[PDB]
């Protein structure tokens, strides 16, 4: 809806920074609404959904098991590792690592999962063989959040991400079980509170994954809808602003309020 794009134009002018935005119908797959859809934005933690999609593709093929246990050392711990820091002795299963990566944005969980699939280049190869030849991962956590302006490393476009998310969620690649698992993780996201969820009515379904990094970078990808069922995928990034994380949150939330109002 036009009013939602005013809000994106609002946010962009207020934050003084680029903002990309996609509304995508989950059923027909048709773009409902767009803004800077072909510009690149840092993915930040929003990559962890694609990472687990790749892990789950390996699980589907028997190259990986969700119950396999991974042990690690304290030296492998990087910044912000709420769950993985607590299991140095007993390790974690691949399922537990994807749960921590998606629901809590656990950084060490991401790197460990990246090692299982063969690194960022292997994740980019996965996305490439999915029809996404735009999205790329180059670095590990936490260096992938550097968000250097015009740096194409660790970036995606709003249109590439929304399409990739739709295929991961409602495509034919992953098995029906792996698709339900990936969205289950997104639905139990514990670190996206003040964003899209804040403008969301009771009874609505939402599964998401947010990101934040350097140089005013903030974002969110989400599959949401009323009556307990998802019906649209929405993508929103921003980068460059000197604004606080609080004002970034409140901008994404306002655009979300207009999206909801105009459903
Ligand atoms: Xe934004
Ligand atoms: Xe949003």
From Swiss-Prot:
The active site is at 45 (acyl-ester intermediate), 143 (proton acceptor). GO terms for biological process: beta-lactam antibiotic catabolic process; response to antibiotic. The keyword Translocase does not apply. This protein is used as a marker in many commonly used cloning vectors, such as pBR322 and the pUC series. Keywords: Antibiotic resistance, Disulfide bond, Hydrolase, Plasmid, Signal, Transposable element. InterPro entries: Beta-lactam/transpept-like (IPR012338), Beta-lactam_cat (IPR045155), Beta-lactam_class-A (IPR000871), Beta-lactam_class-A_AS (IPR023650). The beta-lactamase present on pBR322 was cloned from plasmid R1 (R7268). The class A beta-lactamase family has a specific amino-acid numbering system, sometimes called Ambler or ABL numbering and often misspelt as Amber. A multiple sequence alignment was used to derive a consensus sequence and then the consensus was numbered taking into account insertions and deletions. This allows use of identical numbers, e.g. for active site residues, despite differences in protein length. UniProt always uses natural numbering of residues, hence there appear to be differences in numbering between this entry and some papers. This is Beta-lactamase TEM. It comes from Escherichia coli.
